[PDB]
């Protein structure tokens, strides 16, 4: 009876279903897959990428970036919601082939540094190639690239370094406040009495109140299903999208129910 072989991280097929760049705002484009959000922001001095998806998506992101007339050297910054395999996967490969820098908080940086290994809840089950953060950002810090200001809002919970990113774009000249809120889920997490995360419940609670007060007109999430986005129906993707109030309220209801049945 030998030791078991290593198990690879396998996801649903729609998570790896490539799609053409779908326009969100005047300068905001979704270049990920049908069920994984990878946001591209085109400015006059470069491009900004928020998240990247699975590790095997690095080639697809460069193809859609070239579709938008963005050379690899035009990508200047990589922002992250949280450093998990399904969102920070291709960050290491993207840094090598584009010459871009990565801005993340300290908790996302140390999780990105060990490639997701030794996760607080998943252990070593979701390991991806490690990457190093070049600039450490704080809560409420502003990151400006080409005249577009990105404000970070810490919302710990899913990961200690979970971060919501807000920035104001336009839609035919009229401003639209966009909020990229991280996941508020806790799949299989032990919430009560977790020795690796003692104040996990308190962090989730303040994170729910943080998402509610976000300057938002249009909301996006790393997983489009959490915000009722349908990336496959083209221009009607934001038809039934949720607000920040409905997103945090529905997430808190699933959290309180999970906490109740975890006690019993």
């Amino acid at each position: 009876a030998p030791l078991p072989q290593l198990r690879a991280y396998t996801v649903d097929a729609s998570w790896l279903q490539p799609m053409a760049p779908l326009q969100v705002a005047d300068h905001t484009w979704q270049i990920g897959t049908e069920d994984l959000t990878a946001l591209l922001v085109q400015t006059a001095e470069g491009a900004v990428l928020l998240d990247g998806g699975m590790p095997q998506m690095a080639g697809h992101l460069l193809d859609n970036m070239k579709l938008r007339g963005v050379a690899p050297q035009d990508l200047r910054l990589i922002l992250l919601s949280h450093a998990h395999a399904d969102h920070a996967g291709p960050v290491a490969e993207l840094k090598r082939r584009t010459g871009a820098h990565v801005a993340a908080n300290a908790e996302t940086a140390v999780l990105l540094a060990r490639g997701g290994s030794n996760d607080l809840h998943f252990g070593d089950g979701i390991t991806y190639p490690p990457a190093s953060a070049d600039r450490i950002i704080m809560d409420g810090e502003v990151v400006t690239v080409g005249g577009i200001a990105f404000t970070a809002h810490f919302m710990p919970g899913h990961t200690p370094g979970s971060t919501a990113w807000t920035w104001t774009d336009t839609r035919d000249g009229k401003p639209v406040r966009i909020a990229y809120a991280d996941s508020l889920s806790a799949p299989g997490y032990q919430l009560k009495g977790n020795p690796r995360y003692p104040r996990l419940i308190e962090d989730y609670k303040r994170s729910f109140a943080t998402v509610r007060a976000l300057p938002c007109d249009l909301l996006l999430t790393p997983h489009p299903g959490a915000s009722n986005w349908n990336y496959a129906v083209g221009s009607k993707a934001s038809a039934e999208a949720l607000t920040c109030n409905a997103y945090a309220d529905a997430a808190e209801k699933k959290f309180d129910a999970q906490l109740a049945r975890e006690t019993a």
Copy 2:
């Protein structure tokens, strides 16, 4: 047609076949599997571990260490041949549960830091949890733990940081010079004109001459099949073991043949 799922690193069953501690010398014990070498050296001030095997072997190494009366806190140093998934796998987990330090050269340290990702020949196919080296050793540097001196001999080839470790133990009072030579293989490596490793051929050549002149009475390798060690037959494991001269000569013949058919 979605993107392909991630593929896990799977090895032969005998590579993960656990075995009881087999004695090599007075203070040297093999605690790995039947086809993967993990060496333990018991001194008066602590224990030294050379290599670790696959990532899923961290629990087995601690069990055999406790079999030898070595608590986790007694492990003081972790030496490596090269930082690949099948030899430096459990290093990250071993550092967390034992409180030991890792000594490796600069090239093995940077490969250990990114968990084997972005390999010169394998890319991201063999990723393991990353670990940080605590002390950088040079060629010919002596590392002493509890009166047993470990001398490092750089032999680049399989990896740029491939290292042979030599130390003198005893066998009922009589000294035995032990050489732990790294792998001299190049499975699927592009030898001629490799842009990621231009002087690969020259490094392999000087590495063959390095293994030949090693102070050795008993030779061991990360893979016991390369040195004709049979870990399964108990005390007759070193029956038909090779010398350093025969090991480097047979490895060079397979290298020259690989180089000849690669040209054509």
Copy 3:
């Protein structure tokens, strides 16, 4: 007119005034200088060191550790209040000569990783040799060494990774709750509208309330003057020591006054 020469970090003479190990509790010893706190905790399975002082203090700490019968290999863990040059200075040298591990939060780890460079308020004026944290701890996480449980309490302010450490020792069999609270000062810090630390004021406020509710019978600080400790008068050092209530209240008064005159 050439560019100015580099300026070294120079402190008061009493900060580098070596002293003999002064006993704080049954297992707690102060082994730093007269004006810099370096705490040593002797257990049955090893020793724990909290802070280290200035970088040039690594030799003095080992001498006092040997005075207490603690060999370098007996030091197992290094805890930190915050990663500044006057408290985490010798951490890099202590890790090389003792074989110990460093436990710190993510914000202290990234500050320790760059040796205090690129400080939020000091820039590159207080650079010390960099060191790597081996274990990342969270708020309220318990670290046990030899039966003595260390609980971490995050108190951001002086640095984002400022941490108070609490542990229960004895005094001739009777328990004493010891709290090692980090500095609550802000020397020269820009509090209002700081772009590198937007929520600095809010973090200081919750940190004041955190220090107040600490399980404490005897309080210690990295700088003994902040807690009215007099390390030079021997056994009467804790004569006029402050409580956690008086320490946080007096620190908040100096913070509100600093904030008022900063506005004007």
Copy 4:
């Protein structure tokens, strides 16, 4: 008698004497000081910087880069001879304000990672802000930026990661082979029997033979005095510059004399 205060790294005044960009070739410009070489290469897709000088030179390099019409975001790559305080000083600050990447070998990367601390010969006397290498290069590896190919030649000695950089530029349409050879000196180094660098003498010897066979028409060094460059006399700076043969031969004579008097 308190412990001594920290000593800052102080150099000659001419090492920090700023100068205007002096032209070396069609695309090569010297933008450092009068006695410290900082090379800038202007291509069609970006700029390349070789070395940077002292840590306090980051502002001067950006001013001369803006003098050449190179914005911070135009700097794409930073190459290094060796990671010492007087040559890799401003690398950390340059990476934050320019968005450039650093290419160095493994030995230069680990020395750059700890900011020059724990030097093989200098200890912690020459510490500078740490920086992380983004791409690890090998011996003979080609790095191309904007059509200009940079070939790295390892020449260990001064530091284990000492690297000579060669690239072919033009001079009014006619090609000129430029070699940027690292320092071949050993000031105060213990050459014979050094436990931190056992094969130091053998590495210096092969490094002398490496510099001799460099594809070179015009030679430059990190310190212009070693190559008889006079940065202050304008266009006649390369008047009495040495060849690669004379540079390595004169350096070997000073090495053999140092070795002889070190023995006695």
